[PDB]
Design a protein around this nucleic acid. Structure first.
Ligand SMILES: [Zn+2]
Ligand SMILES: [Zn+2]
Ligand SMILES: [Zn+2]
Ligand SMILES: [Zn+2]
Lengths: 1176, 10, 116, 69
DNA sequence: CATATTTTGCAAAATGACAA
RNA sequence: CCUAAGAGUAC
DNA sequence: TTGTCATTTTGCAGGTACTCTTATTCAATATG
């Protein structure tokens, strides 16, 4: 405070977190990745390759025309505009997101590229080398190549610079965070796709049956090239007891595993000593030499580089190259296919040889039991592809398709000698349709579920969806490296448990930077180049890796790491760059690629003034941050970037997190060494060598888990249940829900901010958009109607508005051009001249075929009246005349739903055809069967509802809103539920807010002391009286406020019954689903239960009369159903058998008849006979 | 094995 | 074993029988470089490997912050502070004996008792 | 959304005590507990009714009216 | 201008010899 | 209407 | 006139019910 350099406390860190969320936000990774893709990656994709050259040779039959031409097309700078929409009339105007959402447009912006066309001419003189020159016809002229969808709030969106007032004007919720696309009016979010990192050597043991014992592999890939995956594997043949332990490498496009020494000799290292030096860096390590001698013994047959190249070419799978050119083929394999991530040029054989030696070294170290096999689940070995890289690779493929099409068109128009035009060449539909298809559907091509419909049930649900990662498929386990990067307890319970993860609150994903400045820094500061590195003269040299590429060695790694840290801590190096120094392995790794997940941490320095380790951040920085925050709600601004640029906080990912020591809290772990028995037991770690400090432990949780009060007092599965269940909580998802035509919307009448609240939930805006209510809960075995997770809800409380909800549903309908003049028309169908008119009443429709808002609608009533033209002059069906030129295509209300029509919206689609949306509003009032849950995984349905007079009451007349069974508590061990009830009682009495943050020093004893100071029993018990008789209950009841969510699972949306209804057209069985009035599945194991019961006739009735009973005729000669049965004429005849008096009828399921007919169609005769030919 | 996890064998 | 290489073409040298002197003779397989043998040992196979447990020790191993510190007696400096770590041999049957490196003398001493 | 008319549990009318509560919080710089006690909310049911309310209607009022007369 | 076609878990069964 | 995909409920 | 032993190829399928939403149906060059 008064002292500027005083150390900070645990309370001060929340100021730092506030600054972080003031600069980053909650969906910063999405926007950052997209901005990186738009600003830089599009230009790189355009410039790389995309130079179409077509050399039209002279083909001179006569020397008069011995001129060869060469047409080249190049792409210059790319311009991406603000989002705009075309129109049926051709007028183009600015498009805003809350117009694309309503009109089912795509929030996309056009792309233009400066295309330069050049032509060269040369004299086709045989023998003489051709020399091409300009003809001075340099034409260049931007062209429209497609449209890129733009995510909201990105740098190229209209809302990026919008203020709060502007957002209100544009019908946009200020709480909306962006980070999603609008494809055809639907909000789509790109789930972060997890993958294994590239250019990292991983060594794995193999099982006993396999001949290879250990395999070292690298998934080599280059970012600035073809972006192709080539997998190099180095395998150690022979088990432990085997003698012939030869190491072999699996080169691409080679049918066999070449021995390693052959590869070394091919690269240009002939002597055995030099090869072993390249492989083994220690002369004294005779074990590795002994293990490696079989390789040189195997390769002794080849003693020359050309011989090795010929050997590789002979093993080459092409088998279409002459003997002397096999050398060239092998050279190409070793240049453009072997370790592409190192280089694609020539003259770098030594670097690739060194890398191969390093891989073999790692393999031999793992085989010698000197290091464990690499863990596949280490989160530092994983990368998350965000919207940026995904769109980048998709656009790369799509633009390659477009440029191949351009080249094909140019070839076609030059071979046919037609004129050349740019507009006829480019096909923007390619890029536009490809991007729209990849984003509209889950699939990512031409993987699945990459893009998903954004969840808008609740604000926290939307936030969790926007920070979701999926792993394509023990990988399901919660790894140690997941600390502080993904939520420890937030994952689906089903098949995706552990595979689907959620980012922690402060976790970010790197967007990738150019490693050239770092390489220049390394070269300047004294990094030895790898070309002239001799391991013998520099034994204790630290290998320096940049993005998995071994760039050289350094002899003083300590000073190099210190200066790299200083540069990154002053901003000269991008803070996303991760630098790891492994002292034991003598390695230095620098990673700058995208997809790395990191988190911020406080920096701890020596602090010689105090004589002990201390945080770099002091009270002065906290005061400046507080001043900036107060000014935002005139001095110099102090933001999170200010802390970053002055070396106060650092970005650490899992790889760098391996080589640091972190203090959990500053106030207890930094200073060197009568305790409260109520406080939990903590240790000081008895060690003072910390390098970093956690900003706050509660930041390891995700968005959904940050809502849980006292999550550290709960059993972990309960926290997981609440994390999965708060996304289904009902509240206010956005403030502008009144101007959005969403398919389904649920809103609480009276959302209440929790009495027990966490510090992390005011960055999630939970107090502004709550999704629950504070209900007075009593834990009591009152009437027996709350057993087995049932609950008793107060009917009087429901009558006054507790948990009441609004429900909106929207129906969309378009008119489509079936032809040139076959346009549909929205109108009120008339029974005189319309076909297939539904049984619902059309009365509520007025002239334009749309119910005006305010009209009550019940189930099956028609709300949108649409008709389509058909071919006239047809007579059938009994009441079909030439007047019936219109077929009804109306949209009725849901059969099980009803309400008041709220709003209807008419507009024009992209094609210019009128289409409408009808939003209908109803009110959901809690009833028996609705599902409610606390914030601790205590789900349950309403068993019964009692009025106020019947509920138990305290001496003050307070009656509970809810009664829950005690038996739900002991087995589930949800102590946090009880603690939060007590804290909420104290907070309601005292008027303060209960601080239910996880790892604070808030104990039950202190809360009880406050409650006793308020005049109540310290443990929350209250003397209650029975409602029916007024007599005191012998047992005192745990009583107090508790926060409950109303879940989306209401009984009225699940009740379903079917006596008889529509049948499937193929199998003649009941249809599937309650939305189609379907039937319940009587599955196999229900049939097994009925067999066990011994009820044969009930089983037959279920399988025949209840589902499908079909009478079919057969003959006694052949058991086939090929019997022609004219029932009215009473004539039965099986052609072929030529019988008419030997026919039977049988009752079999129609599915059985279909199976027999399909077997007959498959050349099998299932002859059915009605008598036994053999004795039992 | 199995399948999954023919046989072995077949 | 201490394998040695030819000094003419930098290639391996293999053991070879001799008749005139009945002695071990190391010979080159490509240039016929021939010389005497330093030791009769030509192949060592460590079924139980004792070395490699202290591997990874570096002249600045104390700079690692993750390595735990201790005040155990250093029997070359009598200094308290030092770093300690368990055996680096990753075999499943290795013992949990600790190794200590003094940060003022870089002398590695163990906590074993059978050896002492 | 907007302040509930009555306390859910007991039924005391609290819909007329929202503006007074805000005035006490702002003009008089009273803490929440004393302001709640001043308005007559003694049972913690009413206290949680008024204390935890979120006035979202202001946000709704920020947007321009759809049907403006 | 409109329709038509370009991750996982092995024991064997089979193969190439073979040796007098 | 079919197909595919995704999300979810109770085990 | 009979055993022998030692590499190379051989097939796959993953629980029971139930709810909801979204997209898409070959594009484009070519002849009648
Ligand atoms: Zn017949
Ligand atoms: Zn030699
Ligand atoms: Zn010492
Ligand atoms: Zn009340």
């Amino acid at each position: 405070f008064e002292d500027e350099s005083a150390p900070i406390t645990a309370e001060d860190s929340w100021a730092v977190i506030s600054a972080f969320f003031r600069e980053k936000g909650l969906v910063s990774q999405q926007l950052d990745s997209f901005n990186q893709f738009v600003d830089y990656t599009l230009q790189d994709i355009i410039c790389e390759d995309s130079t179409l050259i077509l050399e039209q040779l002279a083909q001179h039959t006569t020397e008069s025309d011995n001129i060869s031409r060469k047409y080249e097309i190049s792409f210059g700078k790319i311009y991406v505009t603000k989002p705009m929409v075309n129109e049926s009339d051709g007028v183009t105007h600015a498009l805003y997101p809350q117009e694309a959402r309503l009109r089912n447009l795509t929030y996309s912006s056009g792309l233009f590229v400066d295309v330069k066309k050049r032509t060269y001419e040369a004299i086709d003189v045989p023998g003489r080398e051709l020399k091409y020159e300009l003809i001075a016809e340099e034409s260049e002229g931007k062209v429209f190549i497609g449209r890129l969808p733009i995510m909201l709030r990105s740098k190229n969106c209209y809302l990026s610079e919008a203020t709060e007032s502007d957002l209100y004007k544009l019908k946009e919720c200020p709480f909306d965070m962006g980070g999603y696309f609008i494809i055809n009016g639907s909000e789509k979010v790109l789930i972060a796709q997890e993958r294994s990192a590239g250019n990292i050597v991983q060594v794995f043991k193999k099982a006993a049956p396999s001949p290879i014992s250990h395999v070292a592999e690298i998934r080599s890939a280059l970012e600035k090239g073809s972006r192709f995956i080539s997998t190099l594997q180095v395998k150690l043949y022979g088990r432990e007891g085997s003698s012939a332990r030869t190491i072999k490498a699996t080169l691409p496009y080679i049918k066999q595993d070449i021995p390693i020494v052959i590869i070394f000799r091919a690269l240009g290292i002939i002597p055995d000593g030099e090869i072993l030096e390249h492989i083994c860096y220690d002369v004294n390590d005779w074990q590795m030499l002994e293990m490696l001698k079989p390789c040189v013994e195997d390769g002794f047959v080849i003693q020359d580089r050309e011989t090795a190249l010929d050997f590789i070419g002979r093993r080459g799978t092409a088998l279409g190259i002459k003997k002397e050119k096999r050398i060239q083929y092998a050279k190409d394999i070793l240049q453009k296919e072997f370790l592409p991530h190192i280089t694609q040029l020539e003259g770098f054989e030594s670097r690739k040889a060194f890398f191969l030696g390093y891989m073999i070294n790692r393999l031999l170290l793992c085989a010698l039991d000197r290091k464990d096999q690499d863990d596949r689940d280490h989160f530092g070995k994983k990368r998350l592809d965000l919207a940026g890289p995904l769109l980048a690779q998709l656009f790369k493929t799509l633009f390659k398709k477009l440029t191949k099409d351009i080249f094909r068109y140019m070839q076609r128009t030059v071979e046919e000698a037609h004129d050349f035009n740019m507009k006829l060449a480019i096909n923007a539909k390619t890029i536009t349709s490809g991007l729209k298809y990849a984003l509209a559907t889950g699939n990512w091509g031409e993987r699945a579920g990459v893009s998903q419909v954004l969840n808008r049930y609740t604000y926290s649900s939307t936030l969790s969806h926007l920070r979701r990662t999926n792993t394509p498929i023990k990988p399901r386990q919660l790894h140690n490296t997941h600390w502080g990067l993904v939520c420890p307890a937030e994952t689906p319970e089903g098949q995706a448990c552990g595979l689907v993860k959620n980012l922690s609150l402060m976790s970010c994903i790197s967007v990738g930077t150019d490693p050239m400045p770092i390489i220049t820094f390394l070269s300047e500061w004294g990094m030895e180049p790898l070309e002239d590195y001799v391991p013998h003269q520099s034994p204790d040299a630290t290998r320096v890796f940049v993005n998995g590429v071994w760039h050289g060695v350094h002899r003083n790694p300590a000073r190099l790491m210190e200066t790299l840290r200083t540069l990154r801590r002053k901003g000269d190096i991008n803070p996303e760059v991760s630098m790891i120094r492994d002292i034991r392995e003598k390695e230095l790794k620098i990673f700058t690629d995208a997809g790395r997940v990191y988190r911020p941490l406080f920096i701890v320095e020596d602090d010689e003034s105090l004589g002990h380790k201390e945080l770099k951040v002091r009270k002065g920085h906290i005061a400046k941050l507080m001043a900036t925050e107060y000014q935002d709600i005139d001095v110099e601004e102090y933001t999170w970037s200010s802390l970053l640029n002055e070396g106060l906080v650092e970005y650490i990912d899992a790889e760098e997190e391996e080589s640091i020591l972190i203090a959990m809290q500053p106030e207890d772990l930094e200073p060197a060494e009568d305790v409260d028995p109520a406080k939990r037991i903590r240790v000081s770690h008895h060690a003072t060598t910390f390098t970093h400090c956690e900003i706050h432990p509660s930041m390891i949780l995700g968005v959904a888990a940050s809502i849980i009060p006292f999550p550290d007092h709960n059993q972990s599965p309960r926290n997981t249940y609440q994390s999965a269940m708060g996304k289904q909580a009902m509240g206010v998802f956005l403030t502008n829900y009144n101007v959005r035509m969403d398919t389904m919307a649920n809103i609480l009448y009276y959302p209440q901010k929790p009495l027990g609240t966490t510090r992390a939930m005011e960055y999630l805006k939970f107090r502004e958009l709550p999704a629950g209510q504070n209900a007075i809960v009593a834990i009591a075995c009152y009437s027996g109607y709350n057993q087995e997770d049932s609950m008793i809800m107060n009917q009087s409380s429901i009558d006054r508005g507790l948990f009441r909800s609004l429900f909106f549903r929207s129906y969309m309908d378009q008119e489509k051009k079936y032809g040139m003049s076959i346009t549909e028309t929205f109108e009120k169908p008339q029974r005189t001249n319309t076909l297939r008119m539904k049984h619902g009443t059309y009365d509520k429709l007025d002239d334009d075929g749309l119910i005006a808002p305010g009209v009550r609608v019940s189930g099956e009533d028609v709300i949108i009246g649409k008709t389509t033209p058909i071919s006239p002059d047809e007579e059938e069906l009994g009441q079909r005349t030439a007047y019936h030129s219109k077929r009804d295509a109306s949209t009725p209300l849901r059969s099980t739903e009803n309400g008041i029509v709220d709003q209807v919206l008419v507009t024009t689609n992209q094609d210019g055809l009128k289409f409408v949306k009808v939003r209908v509003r109803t009110t959901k009032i809690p009833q028996i069967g609705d599902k409610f849950a606390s914030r601790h995984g205590q789900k349950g349905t309403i068993g019964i509802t009692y009025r106020r007079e019947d509920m138990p009451f305290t001496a003050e007349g307070i009656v509970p809103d809810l009664i829950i069974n005690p038996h739900a508590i002991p087995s589930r061990m949800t102590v946090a539920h009880l603690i939060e009830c007590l804290l909420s009682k104290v907070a309601a009495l005292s008027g303060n807010e209960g601080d239910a943050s996880p790892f604070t020093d808030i104990t039950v004893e202190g809360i009880s002391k406050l409650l006793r100071e308020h005049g109540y029993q310290s443990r929350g018990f209250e003397v209650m009286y029975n409602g029916h008789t007024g007599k005191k209950l012998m047992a005192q009841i745990f009583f107090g406020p508790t926060y409950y969510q109303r879940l989306r699972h209401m009984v009225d949306d699940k009740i379903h019954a079917r006596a008889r209804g529509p049948m499937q057209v193929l199998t003649r069985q009941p249809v599937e689903g309650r939305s189609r009035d379907g039937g319940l599945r009587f599955g196999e194991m229900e049939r097994d239960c009925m067999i066990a019961h011994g009820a044969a006739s009930f089983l037959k009735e279920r399988l025949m009369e209840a589902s499908d009973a079909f009478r079919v005729h057969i003959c006694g000669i052949c058991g086939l159903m090929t019997v022609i049965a004219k029932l009215n004429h009473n004539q039965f005849e099986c052609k072929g058998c030529d019988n008419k008096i030997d026919i039977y009828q049988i009752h079999i399921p129609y599915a059985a008849k279909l199976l027999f007919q399909e077997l007959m169609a498959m050349n099998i005769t299932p002859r059915l006979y009605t008598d036994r030919s053999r004795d039992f | 094995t199995x399948p999954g996890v023919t046989x072995p064998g077949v | 074993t201490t394998f040695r290489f030819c000094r003419d073409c930098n290639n391996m040298l293999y053991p070879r029988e001799d008749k005139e002197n009945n002695r071990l003779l190391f010979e080159c397989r490509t240039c016929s470089y021939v010389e005497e043998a330093g030791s009769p040992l030509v192949y060592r196979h460590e079924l139980i490997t004792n070395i490699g447990e202290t591997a990874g020790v570096v002249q600045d191993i104390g700079s690692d912050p993750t390595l735990p510190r201790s005040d155990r007696e250093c029997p070359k400096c009598h200094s308290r502070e030092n770093v300690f770590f368990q055996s680096q041999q990753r075999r499943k049957d290795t013992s949990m004996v600790l190794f200590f490196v003094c940060l003022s003398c870089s002398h590695i001493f163990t906590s074993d008792q059978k050896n002492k | 959304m907007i302040v509930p008319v009555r306390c859910f549990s007991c039924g005391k009318v609290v819909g007329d005590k929202w503006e007074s509560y805000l005035n006490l919080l702002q003009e008089d710089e009273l803490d929440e507990g004393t302001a709640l006690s001043r308005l007559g909310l003694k049972r913690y049911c009413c206290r949680r009714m008024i204390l935890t309310h979120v006035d979202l209607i202001e946000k709704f009022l920020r947007y321009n009216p759809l049907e403006k007369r």
